[PDB]
Structure formats: C-alpha cells, structure tokens
Amino acid sequence: MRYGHFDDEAREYVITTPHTPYPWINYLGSEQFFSLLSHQAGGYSFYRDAKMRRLTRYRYNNIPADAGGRYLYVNDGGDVWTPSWLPVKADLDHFEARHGLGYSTITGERNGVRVETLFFVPVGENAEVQKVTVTNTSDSYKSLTLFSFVEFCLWNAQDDQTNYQRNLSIGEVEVEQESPHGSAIYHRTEYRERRDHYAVFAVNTQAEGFDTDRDTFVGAYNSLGEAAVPLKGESANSVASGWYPIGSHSVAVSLAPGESRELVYVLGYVENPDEEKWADDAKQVVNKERAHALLSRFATSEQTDAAFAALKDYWTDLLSTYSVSSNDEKLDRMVNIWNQYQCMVTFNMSRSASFFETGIGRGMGFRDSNQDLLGFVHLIPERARERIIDIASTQFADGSAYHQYQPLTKRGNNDIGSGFNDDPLWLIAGTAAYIKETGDFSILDEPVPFDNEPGSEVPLFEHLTRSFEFTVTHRGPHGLPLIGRADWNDCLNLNCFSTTPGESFQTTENQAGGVAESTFIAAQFVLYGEQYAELAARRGLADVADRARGHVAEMRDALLTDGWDGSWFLRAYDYYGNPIGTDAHDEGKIWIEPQGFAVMAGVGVGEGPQDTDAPAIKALDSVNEMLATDHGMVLQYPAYTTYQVHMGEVSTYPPGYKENGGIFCHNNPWVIIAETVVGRGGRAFDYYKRITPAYREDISDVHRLEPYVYAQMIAGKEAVRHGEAKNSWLTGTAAWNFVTVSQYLLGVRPEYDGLVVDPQIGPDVPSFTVTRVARGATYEITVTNSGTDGSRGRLVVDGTPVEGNLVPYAPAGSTVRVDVTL
Amino acid sequence: MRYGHFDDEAREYVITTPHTPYPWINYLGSEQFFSLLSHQAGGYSFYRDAKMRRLTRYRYNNIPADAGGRYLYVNDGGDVWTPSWLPVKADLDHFEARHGLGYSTITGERNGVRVETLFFVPVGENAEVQKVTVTNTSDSYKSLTLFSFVEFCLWNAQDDQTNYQRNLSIGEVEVEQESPHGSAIYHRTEYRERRDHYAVFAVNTQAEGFDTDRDTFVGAYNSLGEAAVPLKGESANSVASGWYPIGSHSVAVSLAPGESRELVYVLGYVENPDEEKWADDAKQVVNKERAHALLSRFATSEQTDAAFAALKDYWTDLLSTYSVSSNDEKLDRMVNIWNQYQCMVTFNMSRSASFFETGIGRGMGFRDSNQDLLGFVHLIPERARERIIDIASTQFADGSAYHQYQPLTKRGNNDIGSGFNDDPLWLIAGTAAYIKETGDFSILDEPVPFDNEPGSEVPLFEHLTRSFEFTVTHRGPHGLPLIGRADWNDCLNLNCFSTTPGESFQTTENQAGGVAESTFIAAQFVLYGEQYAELAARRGLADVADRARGHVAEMRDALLTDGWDGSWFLRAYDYYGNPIGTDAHDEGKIWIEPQGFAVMAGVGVGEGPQDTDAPAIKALDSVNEMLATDHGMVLQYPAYTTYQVHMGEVSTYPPGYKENGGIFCHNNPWVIIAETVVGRGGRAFDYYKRITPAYREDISDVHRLEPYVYAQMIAGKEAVRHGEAKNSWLTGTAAWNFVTVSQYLLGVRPEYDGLVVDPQIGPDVPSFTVTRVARGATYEITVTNSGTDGSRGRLVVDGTPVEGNLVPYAPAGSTVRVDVTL
Ligand SMILES: OC[C@H]1O[C@@H](O[C@H]2[C@H](O)[C@@H](O)[C@H](O)O[C@@H]2CO)[C@H](O)[C@@H](O)[C@@H]1O
Numbered sequence A, B: 001m002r003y004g005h006f007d008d009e010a011r012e013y014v015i016t017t018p019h020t021p022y023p024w025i026n027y028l029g030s031e032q033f034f035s036l037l038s039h040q041a042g043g044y045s046f047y048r049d050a051k052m053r054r055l056t057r058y059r060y061n062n063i064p065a066d067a068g069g070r071y072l073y074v075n076d077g078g079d080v081w082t083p084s085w086l087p088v089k090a091d092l093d094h095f096e097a098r099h100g101l102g103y104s105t106i107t108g109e110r111n112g113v114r115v116e117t118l119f120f121v122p123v124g125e126n127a128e129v130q131k132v133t134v135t136n137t138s139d140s141y142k143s144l145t146l147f148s149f150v151e152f153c154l155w156n157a158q159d160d161q162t163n164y165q166r167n168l169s170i171g172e173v174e175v176e177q178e179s180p181h182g183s184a185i186y187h188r189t190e191y192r193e194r195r196d197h198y199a200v201f202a203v204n205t206q207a208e209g210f211d212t213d214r215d216t217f218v219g220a221y222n223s224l225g226e227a228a229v230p231l232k233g234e235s236a237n238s239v240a241s242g243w244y245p246i247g248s249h250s251v252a253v254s255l256a257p258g259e260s261r262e263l264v265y266v267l268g269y270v271e272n273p274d275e276e277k278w279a280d281d282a283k284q285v286v287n288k289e290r291a292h293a294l295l296s297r298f299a300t301s302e303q304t305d306a307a308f309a310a311l312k313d314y315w316t317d318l319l320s321t322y323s324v325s326s327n328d329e330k331l332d333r334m335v336n337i338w339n340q341y342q343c344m345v346t347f348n349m350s351r352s353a354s355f356f357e358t359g360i361g362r363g364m365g366f367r368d369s370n371q372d373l374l375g376f377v378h379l380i381p382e383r384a385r386e387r388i389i390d391i392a393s394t395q396f397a398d399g400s401a402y403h404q405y406q407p408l409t410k411r412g413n414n415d416i417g418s419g420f421n422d423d424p425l426w427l428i429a430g431t432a433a434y435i436k437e438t439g440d441f442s443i444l445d446e447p448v449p450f451d452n453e454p455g456s457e458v459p460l461f462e463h464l465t466r467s468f469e470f471t472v473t474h475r476g477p478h479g480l481p482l483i484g485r486a487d488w489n490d491c492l493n494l495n496c497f498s499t500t501p502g503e504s505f506q507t508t509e510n511q512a513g514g515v516a517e518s519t520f521i522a523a524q525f526v527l528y529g530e531q532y533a534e535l536a537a538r539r540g541l542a543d544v545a546d547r548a549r550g551h552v553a554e555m556r557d558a559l560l561t562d563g564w565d566g567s568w569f570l571r572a573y574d575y576y577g578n579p580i581g582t583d584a585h586d587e588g589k590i591w592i593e594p595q596g597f598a599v600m601a602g603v604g605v606g607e608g609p610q611d612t613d614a615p616a617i618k619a620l621d622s623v624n625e626m627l628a629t630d631h632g633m634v635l636q637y638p639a640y641t642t643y644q645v646h647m648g649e650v651s652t653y654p655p656g657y658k659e660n661g662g663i664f665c666h667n668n669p670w671v672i673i674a675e676t677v678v679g680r681g682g683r684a685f686d687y688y689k690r691i692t693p694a695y696r697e698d699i700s701d702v703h704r705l706e707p708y709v710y711a712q713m714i715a716g717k718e719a720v721r722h723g724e725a726k727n728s729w730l731t732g733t734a735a736w737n738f739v740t741v742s743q744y745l746l747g748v749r750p751e752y753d754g755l756v757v758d759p760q761i762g763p764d765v766p767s768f769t770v771t772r773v774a775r776g777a778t779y780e781i782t783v784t785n786s787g788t789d790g791s792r793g794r795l796v797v798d799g800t801p802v803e804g805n806l807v808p809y810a811p812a813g814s815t816v817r818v819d820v821t822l
C-alpha cells in the first residue's frame, strides 16, 4: 500500500497521512546551512559541521521515533494540537506533507483551524525559515494563541549528549521581546568563551510572551506532547540559566470566519568578527547587528515569498542538463527529478547526517567521494573539479590513499589511516569521468601535493600514475591485487582475525603478511587501468600507455584463470591462499561484486547475448539464479550462518542483512550495467526497477523508508524482514543508479571525442527522448526501441544516417537532433 | 519542603511521592554487576564495564526525564497502569519508594490492586532480581494481566546510540516460553560473533505470552506510557530481528479479595567458555546451562528472601568500623550510614555512571583514586592496599603520573597523558592514609613497576620518593611548584591559551614554557611532603627524611611570602609570572583551595583561635567574609564575567556554576578541617552542616537532587539558581566529608603509633560517643564537649587520666574506653 503520491508538476512527493511506516525526511539547504526535516517536522539544523555546529537538538532512537522538531502548538479555546500531528497526536480533520526540492510544506487542520507551514533554507542565507498560514475554516470566530517551539543543541552535538557534568551549567540565552521586526530569542552558549557565533529564533510580529527554559515550557514529568505552557495558554516568560535552552514565542491570532493570518519564523546562524562580538563595553551583551539584518530580510510575507521563488529557480535551473520523456512516468520522474536531487544532496551532505547517520562522525570514504562524483558531475562540473583536486591532495606519495576523507577540513583521517587497496584506483575513476563530461584535460596539469605537504606538488596526472602503479606493485601469488584491510566491501577483512569485542574490523590486523587477493580490485584495475592508459596516451605518453595496457591484459588473464571458479568469478583468496566465493564451499558460494564489475570491464564478454559459453554470460546467469530476488540482488549466497574469524565483519551480520546476504543496493548497478554490456537490456531494466523508488512506491509498507530516494540496504531473501530497507538517502546507490539509467539503460554517455548513444533497455520502453546538454550544446535524442537482446542503436544525426554510436561534439550554442533505431 | 524522610531503623530513605524535583537514584550491586535505579524504576544495568557491557538501554536528557527502566504494566479490566507511576502516569492511591543499601522497593497502588517490587543485585550473582508482590486490596475479585518490560542495549553503549547504520541489523534474541522454572528471553546480540556473553530476562512462572520487539510491544507513534500490547491485554509474541530487542512476559494473576501473589523476575548476565558457547552442533542455539542454573537459584520466593537477607548481612557487617551516637540524628545518620555507603559506592563505580555521568568514558582521575581511598580505607583495607599497588604501577619513572587511571584495565589513559603537576603527590596521600589505618608498613616494600613495564619494579617506597622529588625538580621562579596543565582545579589551565572551540582545555597547550606556579601544589607539598618525610624516617632513612623536611620548610616560607597576598594566600602565578588570586584585581580576588589546604598543612597557624594576626586566621576570616554562603563556600570571588584566555576552562562557566563561582563541595572540607586546625569547632561544624545531605533535607526543593548523598556542585551566590545541586553521588566530596566529620570534627583519627582523639565540633554537639574498630580492637570514646574555641580534649583511658591526645594501640580483641573532656 501507499502513504502518498508523487506530484510531478510540482516536483513534490505528497504524503497524505501522518501514519507512515517510518519517518520520511527531506533535506533543506544548498550551500553551507542544512536542515533534516521529517514529514512530522522532526529533525534538526546545523551550519557546515553537523557535529560541532548543530543549532537544534534531535534524539535518535526516541520513543516514539521522531518526537522532537519544529513545533507550533495551537491553543484553540483551551484545546491544544500541533499541525505536524506529532508530538501532541490530536485527531486532525486534514493532514498533508509535501517534500520538494530544498523545501517542504506541512499542513494540519482541526476543529475549523488550518495551519500550513512552508519550511526552507533560502539561497544565500544561513537560516531555516517558516512561512506559516493560519486559516479559520469554520463558520465561527476563532481566537488562538500559537506557541512556537525549538529545542537548542549546545553546538557540539557529541558533548551535548555525553558531557552533562559540564554542559548542564553552560546554557545561556538573551531575550529580545521588542525586536525591530517582532520578537527574538538568542541562543548564545559558549559565546562568552571561544565561540564567535550564536543562533537566533524569531518571529515577524510582536509576541505576547516567550520561553527559553525547556523544563518550564514542558513541565516536569511531561513529554513534548503534554507541554504545560501551551495547555495553560500563556507563556511562562522563562529565562534559561543552564539545563535545556529553547526557543518559544506565543502569538495571539484572532480570525473571523474564512480569514487568514500569515507569520514568518526564522532560525538563524550568525557569526561576528571577534572585534565585533559585543554591543557593550562590559562584554555581557551580544552584538545583534547581523541578526537584525537577517530578520529584516524576512520581515514580510512578500520577502519570504520572493526568497522561496528564488530557491525554486535555483533547483529548476540546476536540473537542466539531462532529462527524459517516455511512456513510463516512473522512469521519467526518477531520471529528471529524484535521482538527480538525491545525488546533489549526497554531495552537499557527504555521509554526515540522516535518520540513520547521527551527525557525529565527520568524514566519508575516499572511495565514496569519487563515486558520488560520477552522479553529480553533469550538474556541478566546477565543484567536481575542485573536489578531485582536494581529495587527490590528501593522497600519499606511494600512491596509497587515506581510507576516509574529511570534507570540512579537506584532510585525510589520520586515526583510520590507509591500507584499503581499492581506494587509489577510484581517483582515476573520478578524474576520467570528470574529463569525459567536461573535456577539461587541463585538470591533469594542476599542481597537487601528497598528503597535503607544501612543496610536494606534482601534476594531477602524476597522482593517477601513482594510483595505477600502486596496484601493479601490490599483487599476490596469482597476480591479483592484494586486498589489504578491505576492498569496496569494507566488511571483507581477510587480514583481521579478531575474537575480541570492540576491535575495529577495518583497522585491526592481528596477523601480518599473508597472501590475500581481491578479484574486485582486479576487475577495478582492468576497467580504470584502461581509462588511465587512455589518458596517458592522449597526454602523448605512448610508452606509459602501452605498458599500462600490458598490465591490464595480464590482469584480464588472471581473472579468467586463477580468478574464475567455473560458472562465476571467485571473490578472493584469503590470508593463507584459500579461495573465497567458490562453489566448493557450503556458504558464500557466489559474491555479486566481481560478477558485475568484471563484466563492466569487458572481462569474459563473448560474441553477444546468445553466447552462453562466454564467462561473462555464465557469471551473470549464475547471479540471476542464485542472487536475484524480487527486491534486488543479494550480496552473496548462501549467507554465512557461523562467524568466519578469517573474514572479519562480513559474517557477524545475521543472514539477510547488510554485507551478509543483504541487498546492498550500491552494488546492484554494476550487474545492471554488465547486463547492458552483454546485450540483455530487458534483464538490465528489470533489475533496475526492482530497487528503484518510483517502482517500489506500490509496496511502501514493505520497503518502509522514503518512496522517493534510494536506500543503502534492502533486507535479503534469507532475512525474515526481506524487502525492508535501512539507511536511506546517504548512499552511493544514488550516483551509481543515475550513471546506470542515464548512460547505460537510456545509453547517453559523455566520451572524450563525442557523445555515445547506446541504449539497451529492453521492450518495456519502446520509445523515449532524451534531452542532454553537453559541452555547451543541446542534444535531442529520439529513440525507437524494439528491446530485442543484442540489438544496438543505429544513429541518424540531423537527418543524415551515420556509422557507429558516437556523435561528434557540436559547438556551444548548437542544437543537435539524433534519431536512434534498435 | 520535603518529598520523604529518613527511616534510620531500616537504613532507608523513604520517598513518599513520585513528584520529586529530580529523579533520585540508588546503586544496586557490590561486585562486578551494577544497576542504576531511580525511585521510578528508571536506569539501567551493566556487568563491570558500563561503556561496553551494558545489558539495558537508558536515555539521558529524555522528555520527560527518566522515562525508561524496569516496568510492570498492570492491566486490570482494561485499565493500564504502572506502580512506578512513570511511564503511564495513571493516578495512584498510594506510592512509596524506599532506597536502602544495595536494594530498593517501589510500591504503587491503584483501584484495589497493590504492587510492591523489591529490586536487588544479590551477593555472588551477576543479575538484577525483582521480587514482586501483587495484592488484591479490594472487596471484589480481581483478574489481572501483568506485563514485564525491559529494553535491551546492544552491549557497547557508545555504538548503541551512534552506529545505527550497522546495529539496527544485528539485534537477535531466542525465546524460551517453557523454561525449567518459568519462561525466559535471551538477548544474544553479537553472540554469533565475538561475544561470549548474553543476557537472560525471565520469570519464575509460566508466562501466558511474550514480546521481544520494542516497536511491536509499544506500537508505532507511541511512548512507553502508551504501549499498545498492555492496552490490548495480550502479548503479541513478537520475535525480534534487528531494530530494538526487549524482554517482556505477560503473566495471568487472579486474586480473591485480600489475596496476594508473589513473582520473581531475573535479569542475568551469562558467560560461556568458548568451547561451551553452543547447545547444538550447528552453532545456532546458545548453550543455556548456566542461565538455567541462575534461574533455578531464584525459582522461589524463599530462595529470593534468603538472598535478600544475605545482602543486608553483607552491608551491616561491612559498616561495623566507625559509628557515633549523639543528640543529633542528622549527624548520626550521615556518619553511620549514608556517608560511608556513598564512599563504598564511589569505590565500586569509580566515575562511570550516574544520572549525570553517562557510562561511556571509563577512567577516573589518578588524583581521585587516591582521595576516594581516604574515605573507604577503614572499611575495605585489603582492597585499598591493592588499589594503591595498581595505580602506582602506572606511574612514570620520572615520578609523573597518568592524569587518568582506567580501573578496568589497571592502566593509565594514554591519550590524556600526564603533566598535571599535583597528581604525583596524591600517591603519598593515599599510601600514608592506608598505612596509618592498618599499620601495614609492608606495603612500602612491594615490588612496583613504572608505567606497567615488566622488569622495572622497585619498592613502592621508591615510587613515593619519585613523587616527592618530582615536585622538588619542578619549581617556579618563586620556589612554588610549576602548575603544568592544571592542579586539583582541572579548569585552571595557565598553559592553554585556546581561542578555538573543541580544543580540550586540559590537554591543549598553545604556548610552551612560561613560569606558572600553583600555591595549591605548594600547600599539598607541605602536607604530604612531611608525611613522606615521616615514612622515610620510620623506614630508617634519616638523611632522606631530614632532607625532605628541609624542602618542606622552604615551601612553607614561599607560601607565607611569595604565596601570600596580605589577607589570604595567592592562587597562582600565571604563564608570564603575574599573580592570580590577589586583591589587586577586580575578579577572582580570593580562591578557596589554597586557604583550606595551606592551613590543613599548618602553614601560618599561630598561638590559637585568639591570634587574629596569624595568616591562617586572616585567610580563614577572608574565606568566611568573601566565599561563605548559606549553601556552602564558593570556589572564588568575584566570579569572572569575561573570558580569561590565559586561564583556560575556569572563566567559560557563567558566574556561579562549577569552577567559576560554584560551590564545588569537594573543596569545602579543606576549610572545615582548617577551621578545626585553628581551633574554631563551631565554625567548622557550621560549614559542615551547610553542604551535608541530612541537614539539607528540609530544603529538598532548592537542592533538587538526592537528600541522602553529596553532590559535586551546588550553584553559588552569583547564579540565579544558587542552592541547586548538580552531579550527585560520584564525587570525592564523599571521601573528604567522611574524613572531615569522622577524623576532625568527631576527632577520631588513626596515626602510626596510636589513635588520636581530638574532637573540635563546637557547642551544637555537647555529648557523643564514637565506637571505632582499629587494628583489631574496639575503642569506645565518650566525649563531653563545651564546644569552646581552642578547647581541646583531655583523655582518660580505661579510667586513668593520660597526657596528650594519643591512645596507644591495644592488642587485637581488646576493648578500650576513652573518656574525653573539653
Ligand atoms: O562494504 C560496503 C560499504 O561499506 C561501508 O562501510 C560500512 C559497512 O557497510 C558496515 O557494515 C560497517 O559496519 O561499517 C562500515 C562503516 O565503517 C563503506 O562506507 C562503503 O564505502 C563500502 O563500500
């Protein structure tokens, strides 16, 4: 069943009940200031750093979930309710939440009073704004008091929830009931000491009263749903000193039948130069100049509406690079809106904060920085260029990489360190995709240091060479790359051997040496090793290119011999040289990552889809028979039913979850792309639909999480909860699925020398048109598609038939019409 | 006003309402297994390690506070309520909670149904036991369904509340409806992998049903107060797979009028050897032998009642060493019961877990390990001796110490490190108090390594020497000790200079060198420097002793000259050698720590209380005028009203909290002891009453926290919340107050050559008798006390008058009667 509908015209997902299977959130903010916002107004906001700069507090694993957020308590003749339903849970006559791009609206109505709240983070502002419209929909007069509410965090969210021995004595506010445009509250904890910033929470009208102490507003022994002040009907005017600061104003609203009142609320982050921190000589009063300025920009509904308009303009203008129009509304909305929105949110949020990730850890995988780039580079190429230099600047001089990148300081994580041997090859993945999209070969000449050491600068190209050579110099007894701490699968730790709780599976190595190899890195090395070789050749390094190709050919041979189990690729050789992912074993017979990635790299592909004998086809057939389910493909089969001490974290999961039998959505695209490669477009599209939000909307009760974005993990067939997802929003599943559908299913993909048009989607999409803007020109690509396996597109370019699948790049400003038949 | 009363006959604090100012807690467990238990059954339990071995989940900063614990949902004809009042908050006809020594009882009655629960951790057991008695107090038949409830934690509490991306998929249980003695639920998360332990939650009767999935038991959108299963009236028999494991059993109870039913619940921690983990060849079923054995030990009320009696025997026999009988019930109950209980609790729990300390950090101050020992050494001398050996074994070879000690591993915290220059001297404090209490000079000969390095062992005495010499070799331009990172005041960081949020004030040193000195360490060196000297002398090291005395005399001279401001002692010299704690400055004119500690050490003491001119008397008179308030003495005055960058954490607190004008109780005793030293017993006893729990009971509404234990911090006079306490239970205030009243006010204190009897308590306690067990003999000390300033006791020993205040130690088994007149 469903709990909402898509609104394609508005670019919103419309949630039509409070009673979803789980809280469904949206992300506000496109620059430095961000909010997490559930369909019940839950969540929080922070400036730049979700661990050290959080404005407002939020409780994970609360009972009930998501009780805490931006509330507006309506007191109507003594009856108290919130339009967000939570936390009060008073019966509503009407409820709706709409999540759009960078903004959401939530509307609740009860006993003749409707409250609609628009939430957004404006362009160019460090604030979350609410436009609130209160309407008397009854036939009688209403006289209301509305109590706003936000609970402040003491900035360092880790300290805030752990260091009470100090932090219950540090909470400080200032109250400004007569602000130039209404009433305002300032949360200024530790502004007295080292912080040059405070938060402001304010309303564009004179508040009848206020509260800044949570215990007084809520009352002893009460939940948020039973808050005492709203029930009493008057603000207690509480001034916090320590404990739990909050922001609340009471606003009197009197309405004739049918009449409406609009209010604008602002939660703002304000920083002052050090020399301008104080209003007074005694340094007791915060300088409010900047806060007043912000509040003056949102004093009226007209300013707020214009800011909202400017937000939509931003998203509408940003999403102008790739669209599709077909017979399939679900495909179209995923491609044009939601998949691309999600990719942008991953770039903005990294892996900081979701309703699963808690905002305390601040880095993301080095490998993930690169892969995320694959999905946003067509939208923000300038930013992508900068990200590539920033991450490559952290790389070690021997070619190895920090496993975790800290995007806020542009440094590698020193505690975690290096030794995950797939990491360095992803830098080649990132840079090639960047150069194919933009044509900007000049990024290869940028000066880039190693481990951020001044004076160590070499060309970015030289970094790619050190990434390539790292794998060459780190191969094991079969010529396969040594896996080291782990490969893409961070749970496959063959050099760990842990039997002590609390030891990190990723960084603990209780035995040194060994000969553990990865076929995943082999496959990766074949694919990105060739992309390196091509860049070396174009750079005019004919000898470097050719040597590189030689190493790639040897790796291809190794995969197809020592790496090949008979009907699929092995997964690895362990510390002692024993096979992993072989049919000789009872569990973990076939693993998905090699099968998809190796075939993506062309390994074992034969004459065409009918060539059953081809290793590539045997492997993908094996995947289909042993790993594919109704909800996508599981990571390996069978799942391990006992702890495998020589394999690290993988077997610690109960079967059917995460890396031990879960559908790890991120890797499903590699097989989908593999299927288009071998010429089985219908199978490819099928696998895509199995895990794609628009297509899973009909089973929201089984999926449970957001029906409009991808999740990392869907419980596999061996789990009782099979079909149920965890870890929505922040996952490279978004980039890889966007790459898959845009470039391989729809088949429109940037190349150095032109735009390739190679659709392989099968019969379910008989006709479609893609509009792609590439190198300053617009390509209108109309496809008539039989969907037959092995049939590839013949192109007519501007009315004239052409040979091959490559369209020459046209000059900036051009429009190019391409008709395709297959 | 009050919320209860002491019951001295039962040794319990009786809480007579649910509606206390704050959750008031007790500690269960005297060995490896401990529980935090509030008067609303809130809190949690862990085995040994509260960070990584936590059985059950607890939410700090919940709304409302303390909503989560061991609950028993009573469904009576469809009406649902809990005898702990929270979480349901149904109106109770009767409520009472009694906290005793190692157990509590909570009783609730509503609509003719009474439910009493006794909570305790038995001696020799790693479990929390509930004895539940349900009585039908109505004139009608009653048919009830009782639902037990506890929420599991996923063992590692830090992971539990931060790493959802993994741990929402790892919850596992096994259900045993037909357990040999009732029904049992096993929480076995990560038992599959590296954990050799699991938890069992069980009842000594056949449960009608069960639940182990929180979301099913409680229902979506619901608080614990609205749990759906109890309201439905029948268990859902949910079996957890991931998400949030719980333990819950429904039991059917039918009662005629006046009829009662007893039930015994067990929460148990169970560990199997590796070769004994599994019941089955396939390793899917936990080996339950040890669990069934535990459960068989609490299968009946009789077994349970006998275990309860053995727990009372344990605490009664334990507290047989020091007691007083006077005219003052408040003094007597603090000295005989609550103060010594709190001291045992601090040894058992270190600084791990309270309702303010969250159980994640696992270490405690090396300085606090020594100070806590001062207050428990008379009870557990054998355990004290071991603790001294353990902490000294971590000491550095240069005499410096780890600032933080980790009792669980008996190692120093490497990340925090050393450099807090008061730390080494406290090892002398600990060892001297131990040897005085026991006569065990043999401890000084123990082999003890440095920094736990095999082969580096030297006699414990040599560790004391390196402590004493460390101070000698680390003195400033005035001959005062260099302060280093800080002294006892962890917030006096004169070598920090931080202007960046997130830098640790204790470990960050942005300037090296400087000349900062501490007068507190000076006074400390005078006091414990002399004690070391006396030990070296007794050891027969005449040259060493005299030389130590020479250094101590020099330190005295420094304190009284360079360390003296005119009417009180300076607090320090800062990094550039400017004075801190001087009347020349507007703020921080006088600091408490040096006044109290210098006079305890005899520095500036004159002819008697009559001698106003004596610096000790000028300093204490200044402390009285400027720092003493109705709630105790504040740390310094005035408090700093702007950030002092050159002083570190201290001025970051708003005035009147923690180290910036807070009443930091821990330090009040040094002045109380000082006042007995100068012969002002009435003032000493006054100060003692101002911060002591039995005397603050009648102002429970101001104090806010537990009226039966000391808290670390009472808000000072410059704070709007002046009088309100934070950080109850785990604080060196306990040891220092017990030393103060037992050895200085009451005046019974062990020395090497006998028992000193030197009462100085003022007129408010005209007569009292102390019974003290010391070196195997019992001393009955009967005191008649005029309370006059400077009047000191004249002793008659077994009927014969003696000179001096020292009673020779009698042979083990003797009774000695001492009569004192002053
Ligand atoms: O292995 C897939 C994926 O794992 C990510 O690491 C997770 C992992 O999924 C989880 O099981 C483990 O408990 O925690 C780690 C995070 O420390 C990783 O971020 C991805 O890059 C990787 O491809």
Ligand SMILES: OC[C@H]1O[C@@H](O[C@H]2[C@H](O)[C@@H](O)[C@H](O)O[C@@H]2CO)[C@H](O)[C@@H](O)[C@@H]1O
Pocket (backbone or CB within 6 Å): A165, A166, B365, B367, B368, B488, B489, B490, B491, B649, B658, B659
């Ligand atoms: O300074 C007194 C007391 O401080 C304790 O350290 C605390 C300190 O009270 C607090 O202000 C700061 O924020 O936290 C630290 C803990 O890191 C310390 O444990 C005691 O030894 C010391 O005597």
